[PDB]
From a paper:
A central mechanism of PRC2 activation is the recognition of PRC2-trimethylated lysine peptides by its EED subunit, resulting in conformational changes within PRC2 that lead to the allosteric activation of the complex. We discovered that H3K4me3-containing and H3K36me3-containing nucleosomes inhibit PRC2 using two distinct mechanisms because of the differences in their positions along the histone H3 tail.
However, we do observe a methylated lysine bound to the aromatic cage of EED. Histone H3K4, on the other hand, is located close to the N terminus of the flexible histone H3 tail, 23 residues upstream from the residue targeted by PRC2 (H3K27) and usually invisible in cryo-EM structures of PRC2 bound to nucleosome substrates. In conclusion, our structural analysis leads us to propose that the abundance of H3K4me3 localized on actively transcribed chromatin acts as allosteric antagonist to decrease PRC2 activity at these genomic locations.
Numbering used by the authors:
A (entry chain J): 20 to 102
B (entry chain R), G (entry chain K): 12 to 119
C (entry chain S): 27 to 122
D (entry chain I): 36 to 135
E (entry chain O): 37 to 135
F (entry chain Q): 16 to 102
H (entry chain M): 28 to 122
The structure:
DNA sequence: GCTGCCGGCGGCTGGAGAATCCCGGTGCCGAGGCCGCTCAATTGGTCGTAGACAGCTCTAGCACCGCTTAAACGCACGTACGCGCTGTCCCCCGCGTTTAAACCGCCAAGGGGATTACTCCCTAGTCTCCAGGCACGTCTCAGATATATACATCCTG
DNA sequence: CAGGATGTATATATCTGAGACGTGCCTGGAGACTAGGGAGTAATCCCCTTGGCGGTTTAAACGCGGGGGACAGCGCGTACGTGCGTTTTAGCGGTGCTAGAGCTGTCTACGACCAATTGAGCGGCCTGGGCACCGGGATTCTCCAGCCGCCGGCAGC
């Protein structure tokens, strides 16, 4: 059993723990796919900008400074990696 | 003659000269004043001092000596005006404030 | 052994040493504090540069930073921040 | 004798208490890193990610999803429910100004 | 004897009439007085040009139309047609305005 | 009798029909009777937030009049960019 | 002699020279390159051309020749990729787009 | 005296270039002028921050190109980059 | 009437897992002395943004009556709201298990990064003349009235 | 369950006229003709941290089974929002009329700028010793289901 998509790697218990930190009590069984969709969309929206920043800097490595920049651009500032 | 730093004359521990030079290379304006670096350094020092005091309060409330990002996030979210200042900022290794809606709680 | 960088390490540590003399700060929290200082500095400086270019001026003085602080920091932070900014500017001007 | 089993929806509260107090991430590092690398493989081929960049992206997305789930909880409770449903997430995002 | 219109149908005609048009829905003198009174405690002896009152009026109407769109979304989500202050509060809370 | 004619109870000038029209443009059929005060409070806090920035802009400019340039500046500052006024 | 303007040589109907001067005097960077104003003016001209053609289509549908802010809102919001650009902006006398939830309609 | 600048002439030429028999109102002209001024500043500030990010003291067509990619969503992005490249290559072809 | 009887009622008690505390041992590593360099502070002089004064002057605010139409008041009325009962069937929650994350060790190497010679592109200095801005000045063709028909309702049989 | 009468909307012929669009006039700012000198740019080497590999091992994800409780739906009370007739009240306006703040032009002056010297703030690099961490066991912390005395109906008379 080795053939698996990396989108499914966001396991159902991981979503459950994330929602527990969010503060929810009972979760419907169709949350576990909508949350994957939201996660994928959010990851594209940030890694697209991260990729663009790396291309502009003529680098091939996606820097943590770059991810911070793309996040602050998106309206979600990150603390812990420079600034 | 003998020289001395700017912050000694301005009564600060936040770098007036560094802020001046940062405003200078930051392309913000063609010219910057001599008191604007000092005012900005004072505002930065005030905000940092208040944040650090609030975070140290939580750290000592957890019977710890060294400030941790969890305590600092607690201090940021637990003061309404600072939460407003840092509303769209997310703190890595900060977690979330413990808050449970009263509906989810049991009947008794 | 080369390419030294710059940060607000000593300044934030010194601010801690005057407010909680027996409390230290971890590395991750300290880097987060550094990012906070950089973010707020860029915010206020951007607002003040906006004001300076925005009233057809070219010099950023304590009035621009004052209006940016009154314009960014909400509520009581604005009052204490402007109060300490003016006291710092007057302390600078008094002793040459 | 008889066995001990908790009242359904109490360990949910216990996990809410534990995770709202904890600090570490709630998604395994390797699968999330694989997802990030796969989803950047479309934008550019042969991309390298710093060790810190991946975890920056990680806890950024974890905070995003925690905030979304909190808003979803509020929306569901506003709908006089306890179960969070896909339509709750859709409404939370739409009001937040994300889906539309 | 006389013809009477069912409730909600006139509200629907009015929903279609006020959405197609773009003319301003808050009277100018009451809003100008509101703006001047709100600006009193900020700085006394202030002068407001009709262009600034224009801008404030348009901004406020746009903001309130957006808030009522979100509030209608909340009310329909909760299987209601009527909008209540709880919907307005939830729309404001998810937006992050009152958070 | 030259100036300083302070008025009061003018937030009631945002009448119930005005809020109903604004709602119907927003897209609602049925209306509560108790949402009018909440909506008036919401408008008051929004206007206070915008007007604070508008007034502090003028005070920085050392002017005694508030322009639509100033209102637009304040609106764009808080993330509510407004077009049609010399932006 | 034989003075010739920049917009003509660049094949642009937008002020490349004015954009260059405004970048120079806008405190964006210490120095501004030569192709940057051309690229920026081209992008601005494309964006305004797209919005203007959509607004003209809206006006022609409305059986109207001139363009009013209502048509500009109608063109901006009806196109999703423009709406994403102008999501956090509002235009004076723009109105909104007529839409009603299917819940609000009667049975038949 | 006291001349003021705007984008009215260029927006009018753009209109005549897409609809040579369709006019504009005075309010929509200010609306378009404000949109142009807003997008111009939005792209220029992003390019400035891009240059500051890499310790570059210059703004070039590459910085504005990257800013266009960041700002304009998708189809807008790959049309706008193409048009900017076309205009810059026509500019550099004949100096 | 009044005996039994029958089901609930909540009040309480201890067995049940969870959580916490502290002693005991253990590292790991934030906080401190050292070197020197690199840049920040000092003179010395400039020259040019920005303050003042002096006007002009358009313009925001006040009053004042006539209109009229929207705002406020009432009044049947039926429709949405809220609640209560019900019947599920579908989330939770332990248990066995199957496994895949996580560490730990050793390498090769593409990629990031500091120096160097340089060259050649954006800046700086003047002249010039044409494109943008504005005061008109129109005659418009863009708009707004009042008219006349089709329409979508809500009742009847 | 199909027609008829109705308050709504639709088109359309004049009015009818504020104002987008030339038309010049003017002017100021962008382009054309000269160095120039530092900002980026290949070329080079020099690390480095990154991705890859292969044993354990071990907690976590997973599939199954039971349950009960949250949820959706249907019937019922109800009262409040809604649509419409009746004042009435204040926006809207159009008339002048008033000074007030905006706005521009000049002289001046002082403070931000910048260059050559010189000293120390601090960023780094070890380093000894000090705080966060883990173990097991004793100590509590809640949480749940059965025993029981009490209570209120329930068949008879």
């Amino acid at each position: 059993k080795v053939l698996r998509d990396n989108i499914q790697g966001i396991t159902k218990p991981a979503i459950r723990r994330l929602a527990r930190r969010g503060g929810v009590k009972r979760i419907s069984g169709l949350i576990y796919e909508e949350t994957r969709g939201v996660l994928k969309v959010f990851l594209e929206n940030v890694i697209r900008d991260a990729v663009t920043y790396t291309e502009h800097a003529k680098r091939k490595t996606v820097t943590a400074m770059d991810v911070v920049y793309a996040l602050k651009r998106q309206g979600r500032t990150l603390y812990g990696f420079g600034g | 003659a003998k020289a001395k730093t700017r912050s000694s004359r301005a009564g600060l521990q936040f770098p007036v000269g560094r802020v001046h030079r940062l405003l200078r290379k930051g392309n913000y304006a063609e010219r910057v004043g001599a008191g604007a670096p000092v005012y900005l350094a004072a505002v930065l020092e005030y905000l940092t001092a208040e944040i650090l005091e609030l975070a140290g309060n939580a750290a000592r409330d957890n019977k710890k000596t060294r400030i941790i990002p969890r305590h600092l996030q607690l201090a940021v979210r637990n003061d309404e005006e600072l939460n407003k200042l840092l509303g769209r900022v997310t703190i890595a290794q900060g977690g979330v404030l413990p808050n449970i809606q009263s509906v989810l709680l049991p009947k008794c | 052994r080369k390419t030294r960088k710059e940060s607000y390490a000593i300044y934030v540590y010194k601010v801690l040493k005057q407010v909680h003399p027996d409390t230290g700060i971890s590395s991750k929290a300290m880097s987060i504090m550094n990012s906070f200082v950089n973010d707020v500095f860029e915010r206020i400086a951007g607002e003040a540069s906006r004001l300076a270019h925005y009233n057809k001026r070219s010099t950023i003085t304590s009035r621009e930073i004052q209006t940016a602080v009154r314009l960014l920091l909400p509520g009581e932070l604005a009052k204490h921040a402007v109060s300490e900014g003016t006291k710092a500017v007057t302390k600078y001007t008094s002793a040459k | 004798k008889k066995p001990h089993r908790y009242r359904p929806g109490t360990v949910a509260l216990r996990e809410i208490r534990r995770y709202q107090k904890s600090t570490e991430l709630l998604i395994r590092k390797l699968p999330f890193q694989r997802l990030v690398r796969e989803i950047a493989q479309d934008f550019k081929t042969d991309l390298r990610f710093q060790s810190s960049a991946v975890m920056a992206l990680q806890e950024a997305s974890e905070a995003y999803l925690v905030g979304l789930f909190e808003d979803t909880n509020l929306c569901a409770i506003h709908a006089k429910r306890v179960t969070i449903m896909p339509k709750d997430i859709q409404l939370a995002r739409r009001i937040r100004g994300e889906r539309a």
